[PDB]
Write an enzyme that holds these catalytic residues in place. Structure first.
Site: not given
Ligand SMILES: [Ca+2]
Ligand SMILES: [Ca+2]
Ligand SMILES: [Ca+2]
Ligand SMILES: [Ca+2]
Ligand SMILES: [Zn+2]
Ligand SMILES: [Zn+2]
Lengths: 339, 339
Positions: A39, A42
């Site tokens: 995550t 990103h």
């Protein structure tokens, strides 16, 4: 004020921000190590969901630290306890929170996504989202308890004793599943990917074969190992449709499949594989329960060796190099140190 | 010579053919009743696979009869025993046949498809594909043991005690699954279809609600029954993509799904339903093992009432009316009598 790694403006800046508030049921954690998660890259990329969700705020959610303060209603913790914790903090008083199914709470916020994250000197979270680390477990391992929990949730879904296991995806979670599978009695453990570095790490963590499926045929590998009938257990870690397809094709009759990786929306599968072989497919939801983490601790206390999964360590000031290593794809887990 | 229902030239003709040969391990069955199966209407239609596989030969494979002769190696049977049997005869001596997994035998032939069928006065099959019927079970029920086995394989896959069960598809197998589910302790049993006749039969066999989803909203039904959280168990019987989609959407967290109906090739599903809800999906292969049939007998001996499933009975000379009834879609199972 406290030092933190924030999305002030792609990339992350080493900023400086005020400490968090401590509610009646919060613990205040002085951060020691943080891992870089999938995550996190990103957000670093300022990519698809990154432009859509980050408040713009410091990010991160894979951490270990020591409790320095707690609210007056916190139960079961001492100042000084080492803790890791979950990626999402929940309300803690709903019916679902009270029974440990915090993945079901209707008011979950993502640490380092919807709210202040773990890339800061101090982290405040609700006590019921914290998990005490025993002193025989290092800080570096504690910092990766959250992905280790996903690997454990996936790999312990089925009995593996003497079973042949296929893992598709040699990301960190897939590589940890290799080591877990061998620890709990699996026979052949075969992992596939297209990244030679990640597969070599999987081999060092005990994979029977680590197969680059753009260089080598999985079917050939199975004939080499005298298991043409197929695998007993398949753990899908990647979310890649061709990997899922190849895994289903490679299961034997009565095979069992754990689905952790999330397929794209219009993924069609050959349900004849599922039905004619009587396959059992189990969805592994993203936010495992703390019962998983207690089994994790027990396995580490029994000599499960996760240490090779940590490929890079950097000080927090040198965080730029840690995201670089993560980005190359030639890394296991990357740890930032806050000492 | 013996009277038989054959594909001499669509439709089936009442022909006359020589009796079958009896091998060393064959039983010779004098047929008493035969049911019309879903495979049979495909042959009657001279349809897709019908033009591709039928030798052109008498068809049929859902039967009961009495043994009149057996080969000298047949074990465990008396002349006069009433037997039903499976739809596919296998070799009987491979490793897979010897362990009861005849669905795995590499040399299976379909009764009434690849070889002479049950729509004749006499039927020869291997003894290991025959199953003795106890005298307290009627001939009409014995004749439908094969679809009853599929219903049992599907409905007993999971524990149903106090569970809410959704069945998609009110064909005969789905309707039998309703009665089984209530027999083994299910709470709400909801079945969906688009055929009012088939659903009314399901209601008479104990369905809590039988929902015509082109006339009535399944979501409304669940709110009526105070189960907005979703079903615990879903049995997919139809193979229709919208039915499968609606079933997955209607499962609660931790729901369990048995997949009997076979989806079309390019069926895409929402795997977010599977993963976020942690669903367990089990493929139910077509050719159940005789362990299922022993549980079937036991349930019938305990007062499970399958009798409403038989909606039409005809003499074999009047077979034309039986296929007509089957074709309307306004029927349960249809029995041809050979007395
Ligand atoms: Ca986790
Ligand atoms: Ca095996
Ligand atoms: Ca059957
Ligand atoms: Ca329930
Ligand atoms: Zn809650
Ligand atoms: Zn065989």
């Amino acid at each position: 004020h406290m030092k933190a790694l924030a999305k002030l403006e792609p990339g992350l800046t080493l900023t400086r921000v005020k400490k968090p508030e401590v509610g009646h049921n919060d613990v205040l954690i002085k951060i020691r190590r943080t891992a870089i998660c999938g995550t996190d890259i990103h957000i670093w990329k300022w990519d698809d969901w990154a432009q859509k969700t980050i408040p713009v705020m410091h990010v991160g959610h894979e951490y270990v630290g020591e409790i320095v303060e707690m609210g007056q209603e916190v139960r079961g913790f001492s100042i000084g306890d080492r803790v890791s914790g979950e990626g999402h903090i929940t309300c803690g008083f709903c019916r679902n929170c009270r029974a440990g199914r915090r993945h079901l709470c209707r008011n979950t916020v993502g640490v380092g996504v919807n709210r202040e994250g773990a890339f800061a000197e101090y982290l405040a979270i609700p006590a019921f989202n914290a998990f005490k680390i025993p002193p025989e477990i290092s800080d570096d391992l504690a910092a990766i308890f959250d992905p280790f929990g996903n690997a454990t949730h996936t790999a312990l879904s089925f009995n593996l004793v003497g079973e042949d296991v296929l893992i598709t995806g040699a990301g960190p979670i897939g590589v940890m599943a290799v080591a877990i599978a061998k620890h709990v009695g699996a026979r052949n453990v075969v992992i596939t990917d297209i990244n030679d570095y990640r597969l070599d790490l999987a081999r060092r963590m005990g994979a029977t074969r680590a197969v680059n499926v753009s260089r080598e045929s999985l079917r050939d590998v199975m004939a080499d190992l005298h298991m043409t009938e197929g695998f007993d257990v398949g753990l899908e870690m990647s979310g890649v449709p061709s990997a899922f397809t190849s895994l289903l094709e490679s299961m034997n009759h009565g095979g069992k499949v754990a689905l952790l990786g999330i397929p794209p929306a219009q993924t069609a599968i050959d349900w004849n594989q599922v039905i004619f072989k009587g396959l059992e497919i189990k969805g592994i939801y993203g936010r495992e329960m703390f019962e998983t983490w207690y089994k994790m601790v027990a396995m580490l206390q029994s000599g499960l060796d996760l240490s090779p999964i940590i490929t890079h360590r950097f000080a927090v000031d040198d965080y730029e190099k840690g995201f670089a290593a993560m980005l190359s794809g030639e890394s296991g887990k990357v740890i930032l140190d806050w000492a």
